């Protein structure tokens, strides 16, 4: 038998090309491997985690190294709003001379790619000033990578393999992750900011050479130990402070100013330092909750068992959940992915509105790239969370041990849940599409005054509550007389209200009927994607059509054409369908973000306000209008620096469309075709000297769905990325 | 010997497929790499002499992109010199000999990899037997010494910041140039 | 030897040599009967 894959004899004995494909595709599903024990599983996962951390640190090392070596960081910091930051050098012998010239327009004498990752802005903010700073950073992270790699190896050695009990010590892990991983890391970062970033921002060099002798504040730690902490707030940077200079510089190391530094258009560094110090305290306190080796603290199991509402509406409450969660890595991974998915979206939303990095608000292409990047990542994480939730229900859920707890009662009313999600999706769909189409028809026939245009008054009211004066709602922070307004008036409110009421930033954009309709579109997307994923999870174990589905596993082709036909009945198929909806939803919201900003940055908000209420407006004024720079990256007259994006744009279209082949044409067609090819090979002279070792077969039913989805998704991203980048570069 | 003998067994356990074909920590690889190092130091010496005595024509002249295409280009919009291109061509000659020798060896010559069920040669040890003449011993003596030489010369250049040619030239007493 | 030479040495190796050695090794691995 062909040895590969060694972890599955069933696959190893397969005489066809399917052996290789399925070998690759199941290599990381450790639970499914031959003769896996629970202890070996946890040990292998732990080592794999070390490997992953090393890869992250090598990637960061490479970014630092390439910028240090081939970048223009030292030149860029002298004029950050005018010079383009360099990602890395190009060496490509396929280039003709005209393309070499087109990519050599960034000050330096060799072809380069411009960076849109925002690394220069970040590194400058946090106190980096030279290529030697970057280089030593790169060296340091090489060493950290190696350390994690070594720890990975070490913890697979007999006398260093941790026990299963160590891996299920929930209370200790939570204490250390809260107080140490989060709390102390946050405290150390506040240290960096106070000792290095803030001095460097005021023109003072602080490095490893002089930091032991250079006090962050003239008063030292005397005020700290005397509880005279207000000393550290005295004398903030003036509104005329010129970043990276002493002109207008303050002495304060901790503040609560609110809003933005006028020059850099970013959050004050002294606010950021104080933020990190304050949350560090909270995290360190939070990490003393759970009982470890000294009797004080809580048991997680005891908390869960006790949380039953006495009126009985939650049944037995959270009884049994501790064991359910503690024995299921899929439950845990689903929780982790969901939570991280929410946080990644929050990062996208908060970083565009409240930027922390100097001059990044001016780098429009970077702002667009970063928003789109993080929202797409968040989308993937959310789908994965639900995928692992479904896998949990098949592989790890024990009905007996969860009887009448909150988890079991979800399954008890799954039809109520699914049918209501169906209703809300239909309700949003019919009416949102309906209004858009009303508007298109009435505008097309020359009567824009007949449009249905709903003011988003609830969102405008929430803006007013945070102090946006535009609407005249006179509520809370937008009223002078409010207790809310009075309470904060001597602290953050002056700085905050200035930023809110400034129209030349992204902090609470003006919103109108256009913003109303696309928010309901987004809501449609969230509900429908959720419908598909929830139906996936709650029907993973069985349905009327297939009552014994749990016996077939997460992923299987179907159950044949009987009982009416059962294509796409598995919980894996729900993941596959949800991916199309996730990509759609992310399309709508990123189109929205980008068009709203293109018109803001371009000084024509009216274009968005008028065009966005009917769908031809998006098609014409967004897609068609902004395509022009991109598709002229190369043409019969020559090439410019958008040539590469133009080519990638077409590559994306090609990959996407190739996906349709796998999604539309299904397996049996191809297997018959491959038979005739096997026939021809064996009957062709000379050629039939050569013999396959693996019998060629068409891809499996599930494999086709996966390969089709992969092409569809890769094509989606490789189309949109060049557009979003070249559109903005082309305009500004 | 106990340290070395154990180290060989450890490598053989980690990589049985490679060690069985004489790849890695083997006497096979030791000898072959010795032969290349010996030839290599001659090539370095000949390079130092050829540069000094002006054998390479238009050494410092840069190649044209129109004639030789895009491969002449280097990292930072620099072009390859004639000298460097020429030395590369010299190596391409003996690389093609190598490929021929590896895949299509002479019936009598030493082959690159071990045969299906051939054992390795016994390790020589800390000092091989001192047998003067065209012997396997004398080859292994000179091979080990050459590879030490290359290690030293390279290490010296980075540490001191001198060129390998300068180190070699000063090592011979400014004879080459 | 200088650093500006490095792309012209390395890119051909990472692009035309490393992948084909990797492909060859993987091919031998997956066809072994053992």
């Amino acid at each position: 038998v062909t040895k590969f894959p060694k972890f599955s004899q069933a696959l190893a004995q397969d005489p066809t090309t399917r052996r290789i494909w399925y070998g690759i595709a199941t290599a990381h599903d450790f639970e499914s491997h031959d003769n896996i024990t629970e202890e070996n599983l946890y040990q292998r996962i732990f080592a794999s985690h070390f490997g992953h951390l090393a890869i992250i640190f090598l990637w960061t090392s490479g970014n630092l190294f390439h910028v240090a070596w081939q970048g223009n960081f030292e030149k860029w910091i002298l004029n950050p709003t005018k010079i383009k930051p360099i990602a890395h050098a190009i060496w490509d012998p396929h280039f003709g001379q005209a393309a070499l010239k087109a990519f050599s327009q960034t000050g330096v004498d060799y072809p380069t790619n411009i960076s849109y990752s925002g690394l220069y802005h970040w590194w400058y903010t946090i106190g980096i000033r030279t290529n030697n700073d970057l280089y030593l950073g790169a060296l340091f992270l090489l060493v950290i990578s190696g350390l994690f790699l070594f720890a990975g190896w070490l913890h697979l050695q007999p006398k260093f393999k941790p026990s299963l009990a160590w891996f299920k010590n929930n209370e200790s892990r939570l204490n250390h992750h809260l107080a140490g991983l989060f709390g102390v890391s946050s405290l150390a970062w506040a240290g960096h900011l106070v000792h290095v970033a803030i001095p460097e921002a005021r023109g003072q060099h602080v490095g490893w050479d002089n930091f032991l002798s250079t006090k962050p504040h003239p008063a030292g730690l005397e005020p700290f130990f005397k509880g005279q902490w207000s000393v550290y707030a005295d004398g903030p940077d003036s509104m005329n402070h010129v970043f990276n200079t002493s002109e207008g510089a303050g002495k304060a190391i901790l503040t609560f100013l609110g809003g933005f530094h006028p020059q850099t258009k970013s959050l004050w560094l002294t606010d950021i330092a104080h933020h990190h110090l304050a949350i560090a305290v909270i995290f360190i306190i939070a990490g003393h909750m759970y009982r470890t080796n000294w009797s004080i603290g809580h048991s997680l199991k005891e908390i869960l068992d006790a949380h039953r509402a006495p009126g009985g509406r939650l049944g037995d409450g959270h009884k049994g959940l501790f064991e359910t969660i503690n024995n299921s890595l899929h439950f845990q991974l689903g929780l982790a992915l969901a939570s991280l998915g929410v946080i990644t979206s929050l990062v996208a939303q908060h970083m565009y509105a409240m930027p922390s990095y100097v001059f990044i608000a001016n780098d429009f292409t970077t702002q667009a790239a970063l928003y789109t990047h993080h929202q797409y990542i968040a989308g993937f994480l959310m789908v994965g969370a639900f995928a692992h939730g479904a896998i949990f229900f098949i592989r790890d859920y024990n009905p007996e041990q969860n009887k009448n707890n909150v988890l079991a009662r979800m399954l008890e009313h799954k039809e109520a849940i699914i049918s209501h999600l169906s209703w809300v999706s239909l309700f949003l769909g019919f009416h949102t599409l309906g209004i858009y189409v009303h508007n298109d028809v009435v505008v097309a026939f020359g009567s824009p005054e007949k449009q249905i245009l709903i003011e988003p008054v609830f969102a405008q009211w929430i803006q007013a509550a945070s102090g946006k004066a535009l609407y005249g709602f006179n509520i809370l922070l937008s009223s002078s007389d409010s207790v809310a307004t009075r309470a904060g008036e001597s602290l953050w409110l002056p700085g905050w209200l200035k930023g809110v009421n400034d129209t030349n930033n992204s902090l609470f954009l003006d919103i109108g009927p256009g913003d109303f309709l696309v928010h309901h579109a987004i809501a449609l997307g969230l509900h429908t994607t959720t419908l598909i994923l929830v139906k996936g999870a709650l029907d993973a174990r069985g349905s009327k059509l297939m009552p014994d589905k749990k016996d077939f596993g997460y992923s299987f082709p179907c159950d044949g054409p009987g009982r009416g036909g059962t294509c796409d009945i598995s919980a894996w198929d729900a993941f596959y369908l949800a991916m199309f909806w996730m990509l759609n939803t992310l399309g709508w919201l990123t189109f929205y973000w980008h068009w709203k900003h293109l018109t803001l940055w371009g000084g024509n908000v009216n274009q968005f306000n008028e065009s966005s209420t009917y769908l031809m407006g998006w098609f014409r004024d967004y897609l068609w209008l902004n395509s022009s720079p991109l598709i002229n990256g190369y043409n019969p007259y020559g090439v410019n620096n958008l040539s590469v994006w133009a080519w990638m744009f077409l590559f994306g279209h090609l990959v996407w469309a190739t996906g349709f082949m796998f999604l539309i044409s299904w397996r049996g067609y191809w297997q018959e075709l491959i038979e005739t090819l096997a026939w021809a090979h064996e009957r062709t002279p000379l050629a039939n000297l050569i013999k396959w070792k693996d019998k060629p077969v068409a891809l499996s039913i599930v494999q086709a769905r996966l390969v089709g989805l992969a092409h569809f998704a890769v094509g989606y991203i490789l189309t949109y990325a060049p557009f979003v980048i070249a559109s903005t570069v082309g305009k500004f | 010997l106990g340290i070395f003998r154990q180290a060989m067994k450890d490598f053989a356990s980690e990589y049985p497929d490679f060690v069985s074909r004489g790849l890695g920590v083997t006497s096979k690889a030791e000898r072959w790499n010795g032969r290349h190092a010996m030839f290599g130091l001659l090539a370095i010496v000949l390079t130092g002499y050829a540069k000094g005595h002006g054998w390479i024509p238009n050494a410092d002249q840069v190649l044209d992109m129109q004639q030789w295409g895009t491969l002449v280009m280097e990292g930072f919009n620099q072009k390859i010199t004639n000298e460097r291109a020429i030395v590369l061509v010299a190596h391409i000659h003996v690389l093609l000999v190598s490929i021929a020798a590896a895949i299509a060896p002479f019936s009598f010559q030493d082959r690159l990899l071990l045969r299906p069920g051939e054992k390795d040669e016994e390790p020589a040890g800390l000092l091989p037997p001192f047998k003067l003449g065209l012997t396997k011993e004398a080859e292994l003596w000179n091979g080990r010494l050459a590879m030490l030489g290359v290690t030293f010369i390279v290490a010296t250049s980075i540490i001191t910041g001198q060129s390998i040619l300068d180190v070699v030239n000063k090592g011979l007493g400014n004879i080459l140039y | 030897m200088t650093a500006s030479y490095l792309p012209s040495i390395l890119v051909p190796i990472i692009g035309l040599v490393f992948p084909f050695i990797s492909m060859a090794l993987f091919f031998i691995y997956v066809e072994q009967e053992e």
């Binding site: 190294f65 030279t130 030697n132 280089y135 790699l149 | 980690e14 | -």
Partner: peptide
């Protein structure tokens, strides 16, 4: 700014994760 010497130090140091990656890969 960054010298040839600095680039060679980086390349030499990058052998440490390379070798260790090989070891971890094998052990997994």
């Amino acid at each position: 700014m960054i010298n040839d010497s600095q680039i060679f130090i980086a390349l030499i140091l990058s052998l440490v994760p390379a070798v260790l990656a090989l070891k971890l890969a094998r052990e997994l």
